[PDB]
Amino acid sequence: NLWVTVYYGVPVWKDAETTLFCASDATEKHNVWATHACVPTDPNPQEIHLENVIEEFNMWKNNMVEQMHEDIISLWDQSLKPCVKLTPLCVTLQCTNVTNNITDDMRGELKNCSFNMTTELRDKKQKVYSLFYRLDVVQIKEYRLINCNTSAITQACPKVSFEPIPIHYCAPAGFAILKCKDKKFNGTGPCPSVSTVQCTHGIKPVVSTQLLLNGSLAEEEVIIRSENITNNAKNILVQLNTPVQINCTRPNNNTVKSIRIGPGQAFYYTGDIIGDIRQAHCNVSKATWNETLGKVVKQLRKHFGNNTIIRFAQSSGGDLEVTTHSFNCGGEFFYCNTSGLFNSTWISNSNDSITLPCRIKQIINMWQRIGQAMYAPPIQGVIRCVSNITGLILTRDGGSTNSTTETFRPGGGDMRDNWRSELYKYKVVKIEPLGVAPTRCKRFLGAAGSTMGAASMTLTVQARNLLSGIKQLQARVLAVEHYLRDQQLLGIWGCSGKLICCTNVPWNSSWSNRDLSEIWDKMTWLQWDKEISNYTQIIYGLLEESQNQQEKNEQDLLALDKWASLWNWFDITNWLWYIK
Amino acid sequence: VLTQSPGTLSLSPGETAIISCRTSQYGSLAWYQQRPGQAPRLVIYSGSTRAAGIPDRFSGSRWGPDYNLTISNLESGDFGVYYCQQYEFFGQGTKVQ
Amino acid sequence: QVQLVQSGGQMKKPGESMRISCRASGYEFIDCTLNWIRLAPGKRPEWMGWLKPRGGAVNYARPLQGRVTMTRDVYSDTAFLELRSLTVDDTAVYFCTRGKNCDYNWDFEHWGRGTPVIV
Amino acid sequence: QVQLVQSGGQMKKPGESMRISCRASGYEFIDCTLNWIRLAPGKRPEWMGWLKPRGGAVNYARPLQGRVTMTRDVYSDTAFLELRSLTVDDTAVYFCTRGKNCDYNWDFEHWGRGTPVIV
Ligand SMILES: *[C@@H]1O[C@H](CO)[C@@H](O[C@@H]2O[C@H](CO)[C@@H](O[C@@H]3O[C@H](CO[C@H]4O[C@H](CO[C@H]5O[C@H](CO)[C@@H](O)[C@H](O)[C@@H]5O)[C@@H](O)[C@H](O)[C@@H]4O[C@H]4O[C@H](CO)[C@@H](O)[C@H](O)[C@@H]4O)[C@@H](O)[C@H](O[C@H]4O[C@H](CO)[C@@H](O)[C@H](O)[C@@H]4O)[C@@H]3O)[C@H](O)[C@H]2NC(C)=O)[C@H](O)[C@H]1NC(C)=O
Ligand SMILES: *[C@@H]1O[C@H](CO)[C@@H](O[C@@H]2O[C@H](CO)[C@@H](O[C@@H]3O[C@H](CO[C@H]4O[C@H](CO)[C@@H](O)[C@H](O)[C@@H]4O)[C@@H](O)[C@H](O[C@H]4O[C@H](CO)[C@@H](O)[C@H](O)[C@@H]4O)[C@@H]3O)[C@H](O)[C@H]2NC(C)=O)[C@H](O)[C@H]1NC(C)=O
Ligand SMILES: *[C@@H]1O[C@H](CO)[C@@H](O[C@@H]2O[C@H](CO)[C@@H](O[C@@H]3O[C@H](CO[C@H]4O[C@H](CO)[C@@H](O)[C@H](O)[C@@H]4O)[C@@H](O)[C@H](O)[C@@H]3O)[C@H](O)[C@H]2NC(C)=O)[C@H](O)[C@H]1NC(C)=O
Ligand SMILES: *[C@@H]1O[C@H](CO)[C@@H](O[C@@H]2O[C@H](CO)[C@@H](O)[C@H](O)[C@H]2NC(C)=O)[C@H](O)[C@H]1NC(C)=O
Ligand SMILES: *[C@@H]1O[C@H](CO)[C@@H](O[C@@H]2O[C@H](CO)[C@@H](O)[C@H](O)[C@H]2NC(C)=O)[C@H](O)[C@H]1NC(C)=O
Ligand SMILES: *[C@@H]1O[C@H](CO)[C@@H](O[C@@H]2O[C@H](CO)[C@@H](O)[C@H](O)[C@H]2NC(C)=O)[C@H](O)[C@H]1NC(C)=O
Ligand SMILES: *[C@@H]1O[C@H](CO)[C@@H](O)[C@H](O)[C@H]1NC(C)=O
Ligand SMILES: *[C@@H]1O[C@H](CO)[C@@H](O)[C@H](O)[C@H]1NC(C)=O
Ligand SMILES: *[C@@H]1O[C@H](CO)[C@@H](O)[C@H](O)[C@H]1NC(C)=O
Ligand SMILES: *[C@@H]1O[C@H](CO)[C@@H](O)[C@H](O)[C@H]1NC(C)=O
Ligand SMILES: *[C@@H]1O[C@H](CO)[C@@H](O)[C@H](O)[C@H]1NC(C)=O
Ligand SMILES: *[C@@H]1O[C@H](CO)[C@@H](O)[C@H](O)[C@H]1NC(C)=O
Ligand SMILES: *[C@@H]1O[C@H](CO)[C@@H](O)[C@H](O)[C@H]1NC(C)=O
């Protein structure tokens, strides 16, 4: 004879999305990428491994990536908003080729580009000579700026840097982030080993289009991530085992000067170039890249036919962001031509650097929004970077009929792929603490894979985590509302007290009987919740009716006034005179 | 990579049309209709799911790496050319007459 | 409400280049792909390529690489298909298409009027 | 990081005036008091004064009152120490100093390079 019992806090998961808040480890640093709305990080104090749990991870549909895209866009816009506008600078420029002193070819396509401009006093004007890159300037020799006819240009504030700073994403109270620690996790499937972690592993916001930079590296081998790799539209993300070191630089002294375009507004421009005019370049070691492409070819050959000829090639077309590797170095935006590193062909089976040309634009329209642009101020002196090419993004040229050759090209344009490469492991799971089980009474997040009864001994800890700008307030208010809903349901069932509560409702055979022997011995709470999920509303309603309405009526004023010596008069009759 | 049969299907009004499609790849198969002189329009996707505005008359179901399009009680708005589609790959098309 | 409007009626002789514009409306132009389809009488349909207008990323069908270009204007929501080195086998109706949704783009519910091209 | 940078090496005669700049960087210049210290062999360290470069408030030491002025340029983040009627006994090395934190002023943690002045 087993009847229903109600447990509060049993560990179970619902995959609902939610707003995840900041966690950034702690004056110069405050200028860049930090809104100081972000709490200091605890030193990874709670990483509770969960033993013998199989959770379905799908990197491709997780709300954390979209939330991070919105958050990084908002961070960028907030940084740009209190900075000088360059609407005064949309003027007619008389541009001339940079002075080589003879007819020598101009390198980088720098253009002298004088203009009239304004000053602090409204009446006066000040002729200004400023070298502008040709990609920034468009003809109308009369010349104008590229984005004048479409979008207003907001200068980045001069002191502000853009260097990536790690951001840890931590779920609110009532939701717990689950990390998949499995090596060789291709991103979409069951994860053999799961852990509960409060905060993600300090994801770095780094913006790079073709080749991911400074990301996290795989442990064992290259991993090829793609949903339906047969599909052409879906990008193939590649996580590399070994970093490939890219050494990038602009070799120009770049003498910078400033003018005041208005009251409290300043404009920073390239006054002059002291040294020789030289192209920007990025070096990648040829042997390292050859080995990396060999490893990537092996992992790609696994998915397609083993006989297939895998050929790489330059990007077919698009905007300069898509067509070329984009990235910032020391505050200067580089667009580097990757055709040198992707034109090999691999047929079925040293100390020289592949030098990639690079062109630098000052006017950046990143995130590909309509109607917005930013002027990156020039940076004085020679700039260098030593990035690690930790990941690649590829797309397969499709439409071929038969033939063993597969053409892979660099791809991009959508920056969600960059953050998918780092947030692949993480999932957000809601905690639905309430649960109902059979038992013969008849009156954080650890041990999830542990069988029932083991959970109850630690039950309290889950009940402790619950209950702990506009979206954060909404998150907290919804956490409070969820807690009040759970407590109200617990009270309506008669279980005002938390923890174990026993209730007289007979365990119907219809409610997924299951034999009522292994249920409690050999089985964990999650598989139970999978079983009884459909019947839960009926159980809740029957609990409310049986041990709340009937219990109220049989413990209403009944027994409140108990004086009955002549009780059961319709039986006192039955042996009143019958004895006689 | 994929094909469909029969090439031409000569039926009268009120009869049921059956068109088979053989695929050599895993991937959801959609069926399109082309009225002569108009742009083609999707009639079903995912093998058996109908597009918006398509009547119950159109349906399809099959097992293995084959697909079937069944069209009961042919009407005047039928008698187009019917195309298989997999991941950016089409069949030669069946003309219903 | 999703609408794709094509300019057409062009006639070209072998060796000439050709351009088709496709104006898209009724939905956010940026976030959803476009595909180009070539339907000829008596031939199998040929898929020509896809274009992601957010970054303008383009994927051409392998038989037509080196001949086809696709570009786009986002301030006037237009997609331009340029085809070079026309031959007699390029006579067909050219369609600009978009999937049912922007996650699985191959379910082309939405098609343009169709641009006949005769060579 | 906190840095104070001075310009020095001034060579003056008796009776002339002198000006020493002190550029502050790293910390918010307008949220922390500066002090000016004088060091020399033989004689004790001497405090010249403190400067609060928000309101520009200044406090001078009694031996130097009427001879020493302090100014602040909040847009260049530059304090200035001007000394009049410079004489032989003012030959010394001058420091621009800041406390360890902006709550207690006399824990001079951040010192500049130093400004020699030879009369
Ligand atoms: C890209 O994304 C697509 C989806 O868009 C993914 O395609 C799907 O892939 C999965 C596998 O990942 C496919 O499931 C497998 O399909 C096999 C066949 O399933 C179809 O046929 C069976 C009947 O087959 C019997 O008869 C065959 C012919 O005699 C015989 O070969 C076979 O052995 C069987 O005897 C149907 O029951 C089933 O519903 C399915 O139907 C297909 O065709 C109909 C046509 O109307 C269509 O509606 C369906 O959508 C589908 O196209 C089969 O080999 C395999 O079975 C394996 O698993 C089962 C587990 O139960 C196990 O019992 C068995 O022993 C095998 O181990 C499995 O079911 C799925 O069908 C694909 N769906 C589509 C729409 O294409 C694709 O995987 C993905 N690519 C990548 C790389 O991720
Ligand atoms: C992937 O990750 C790599 C490795 O970290 C990054 O490479 C770093 O790049 C940044 C700039 O992008 C470098 O930091 C800058 O270095 C310059 C040199 O520093 C001088 O001063 C410091 C003082 O501590 C000395 O240690 C050093 O020897 C030099 O004398 C400076 O130009 C920068 O500081 C100046 O500008 C910044 C504005 O950002 C101000 O905050 C400073 O006050 C100052 O004015 C800055 O320090 C860094 O050194 C590089 N790391 C290396 C070589 O290991 C890649 O950028 C990253 N890739 C991508 C694509 O993001
Ligand atoms: C794609 O990979 C291909 C296979 O490696 C590369 O193709 C090779 O590219 C070279 C360089 O152009 C072709 O020409 C060779 O070049 C030199 C002579 O070049 C001289 O002139 C150039 C002027 O630009 C100058 O820069 C050089 O320093 C030299 O002074 C000779 O060694 C050869 O005879 C030859 O002509 C090769 O022909 C070509 N090989 C093949 C098999 O096609 C291609 O460069 C790669 N693309 C990218 C973008 O990296
Ligand atoms: C702003 O100006 C640019 C540059 O003129 C316009 O873009 C096109 O630029 C190409 C470059 O080859 C020219 O061939 C085209 O003629 C330009 N288009 C037009 C309509 O002239 C861009 O379209 C302009 N922006 C707006 C909103 O009109
Ligand atoms: C851009 O052109 C201006 C005007 O020709 C150059 O400015 C001149 O530079 C020379 C050499 O330094 C000076 O002697 C002249 O006095 C400057 N002229 C004016 C009107 O200021 C400028 O150098 C050019 N830009 C370069 C070389 O980058
Ligand atoms: C990136 O650099 C490569 C270097 O080869 C460029 O490739 C050339 O592209 C033009 C464009 O038509 C061709 O005419 C040349 O024949 C190509 N050269 C080779 C060796 O294939 C490529 O155009 C550059 N990309 C960009 C966006 O500037
Ligand atoms: C500048 O150089 C270009 C080649 O890049 C040349 O065509 C043009 O005529 C030059 N213009 C001037 C004004 O010298
Ligand atoms: C600047 O303004 C003056 C006003 O007289 C005008 O004559 C001149 O052409 C302008 N200069 C340039 C370089 O546009
Ligand atoms: C690899 O990804 C495929 C889809 O491409 C998925 O079906 C499969 O489960 C994954 N394999 C794992 C996690 O071992
Ligand atoms: C740029 O020129 C200045 C001129 O004073 C020089 O001091 C400096 O070293 C130069 N920069 C480089 C990177 O050589
Ligand atoms: C990049 O520069 C580092 C020093 O910063 C050097 O050790 C390394 O070999 C260089 N790598 C390449 C590929 O040039
Ligand atoms: C180096 O590159 C060549 C040409 O692409 C290739 O054949 C060879 O296998 C590569 N060697 C490696 C990966 O050791
Ligand atoms: C680049 O790679 C080296 C070698 O693995 C590694 O030690 C270093 O930390 C990497 N750099 C960054 C910025 O992660």
Where along chain C do its domains lie? Answer: 1-119
Where along chain B do its domains lie? Answer: 1-97
Query: In 3-state terms, what secondary structure has residue A26?
Result: coil
Optimal mutation site among B26, B87, B89, B92, interface A, most CBs of chain A within 10 A: B87
**E-assigned strand segments in A420-542:** 426-431, 435-439, 501-506
Which atom number of ligand 12 is nearest to the Cα of residue A345?
Answer: 5
- Which amino acid, A191? C
| A341 CA distance to ligand 3 middle (Å) | 14
Method: cryo-EM
Query: In 3-state terms, what secondary structure has residue D74?
Result: coil
Interface contact A230-B87, CB threshold 8 A = yes
Interface contact C109-B52, CB threshold 8 A = yes
Cross-strand pairs, D89 = none
The closest residue, in CA terms, to atom 24 on ligand 4 is A149
Cis bond before residue B6 (omega within 30° of 0): yes
Closest among A280, A290, A230 to A251, alpha carbons compared: A280
Interface contact A232-B27, CB threshold 8 A = no
Q: What is each CA distance from A294 to A167, A216, A310, A347, C22, in whole angstroms? A: 33, 20, 10, 11, 41
Q: How do beta strands A114-115 and A128-129 pair?
A: antiparallel
Phi then psi for A340, rounded to 5 degrees? -65, -35
Extract the tokens encoding C67.
Answer: 């001949």
Question: Computed from CA positions of residues A281, A286, A292, A297, in that sequence, does the dihedral angle turn out positive or negative?
Answer: positive
Q: What is each CA distance from A301 to A231, A295, A298, in whole angstroms? A: 16, 10, 5
Q: Which long-range contacts (CB under 8 A, 24 or more apart) does D101-110 make?
A: D102/D27, D102/D31, D102/D32, D102/D33, D105/D33, D105/D35, D105/D50, D108/D35, D108/D37, D110/D2, D110/D3, D110/D4
Extract the tokens encoding A212.
Answer: 């991911």
Return the DSSP state at D76: T
Interface contact B1-A231, CB threshold 8 A = no
CB D113 within 8 A of CB D93: no
Cross-strand pairs, C34 = C51
Spell out a b/e string for A210-229, using b for 16 or more CB atoms within 10 Å of the CB, else e: bbbbbbbebeeebbbbbbee
The answer to whether D and C touch (≥3 CB pairs < 8 Å) is no
Dist. CA A359–CA A334, nearest whole Å: 6
Extract the tokens encoding A535.
Answer: 């019947």
CB D113 within 8 A of CB D37: no
Return the DSSP state at A220: S
The closest residue, in CA terms, to atom 3 on ligand 8 is A116
CB D70 within 8 A of CB D80: yes
Q: Is A241's C-beta closer than 6 angstroms to any atom of ligand 10? A: no
Closest Cα in chain A to C48: A399
CB A413 within 8 A of CB C54: yes
Interface contact B87-A401, CB threshold 8 A = no
Looking at all shown ligands, the one closest to residue B70's CA atom is: 1
**CB-nearest partner of B42 from C46, C109, C112:** C109
Closest Cα in chain A to C99: A233
Closest Cα in chain A to B26: A230
Dist. CA A44–CA A168, nearest whole Å: 10
Cross-strand pairs, D98 = D34, D110
| A273 CA distance to ligand 6 middle (Å) | 28
Dist. CA A295–CA A240, nearest whole Å: 9
The radius of gyration of chain B's CA atoms, rounded to the nearest angstrom, is 12
Return the DSSP state at A167: B
Which atom number of ligand 8 is nearest to the Cα of residue A91?
Answer: 14
Cross-strand pairs, A385 = A248
The reported resolution of this PDB entry, expressed in Å, is 3.5
Closest Cα in chain B to A232: B87
Residue D104 burial (CB < 10 Å; 0-12/13-18/19+)? exposed
| Residues of B in Cβ contact (< 8 Å) with A401 | 1, 89
Look-up of token digits 């405090």: D47
The closest residue, in CA terms, to atom 2 on ligand 11 is A247
The radius of gyration of chain A's CA atoms, rounded to the nearest angstrom, is 33
CB A9 within 8 A of CB A548: no
Phi then psi for A298, rounded to 5 degrees? -60, -50
Look-up of token digits 């059979």: A438
CB A367 within 8 A of CB A80: no
Which atom number of ligand 3 is nearest to the Cα of residue A314?
Answer: 49
Dist. CA A527–CA A545, nearest whole Å: 27
Ramachandran bin of D106, using left for φ above 0, alpha for ψ from -120 to 50, beta for the remaining angles: alpha
- Which amino acid, A157? C
List D residues 12-71 in contact with A (Cβ-Cβ < 8 A): 26-28
The radius of gyration of chain D's CA atoms, rounded to the nearest angstrom, is 14
CB B5 within 8 A of CB B90: no
Closest Cα in chain B to C111: B39
B52: distance to nearest CA of chain C, Å? 9
Query: Which one of A56, A186, A300 would you pick to mutate in the ligand 9 pocket, going by the greatest count of ligand atoms within 8 A of its CB?
Result: A186
Dist. CA C107–CA B46, nearest whole Å: 8
Query: In 3-state terms, what secondary structure has residue B81?
Result: strand
| A277 CA distance to ligand 7 middle (Å) | 16
Q: Which CATH number fits domain B1-97: 1.10.1040.10, 2.60.40.10, 3.40.50.1820, 3.40.50.1110?
A: 2.60.40.10
Q: CB under 8 Å to A75, separation ≥6 — which residues?
A: A33, A35, A205
Closest among A407, C40, A60, C108 to B88, alpha carbons compared: C108
Q: CB under 8 Å to A445, separation ≥6 — which residues?
A: A11, A48, A50, A176, A196, A431, A462, A465
Whether chain C has a CB inside 8 Å of the CB on B87: the answer is yes
Query: Which one of A253, A257, A380 would you pick to mutate in the ligand 10 pocket, going by the greatest count of ligand atoms within 8 A of its CB?
Result: A253
Dist. CA C86–CA C11, nearest whole Å: 11
Those residues of chain A whose CB sits closer than 8 Å to some CB in chain B are 228, 230-232, 398-399, 401-402
Dist. CA A492–CA A545, nearest whole Å: 9
Q: Is A339's C-beta closer than 6 angstroms to any atom of ligand 3? A: yes
Neighbouring C-beta atoms of residue A410, cutoff 10 Å: 26
Q: Is A458's C-beta closer than 6 angstroms to any atom of ligand 13? A: no
Q: The domain C1-119: what is its CATH number?
A: 2.60.40.10
Dist. CA B82–CA B42, nearest whole Å: 10
Cross-strand pairs, C73 = C78
Neighbouring C-beta atoms of residue A363, cutoff 10 Å: 21
CA A353 to chain centre: 34
The closest residue, in CA terms, to atom 4 on ligand 10 is A274
Whether chain A has a CB inside 8 Å of the CB on C105: the answer is yes
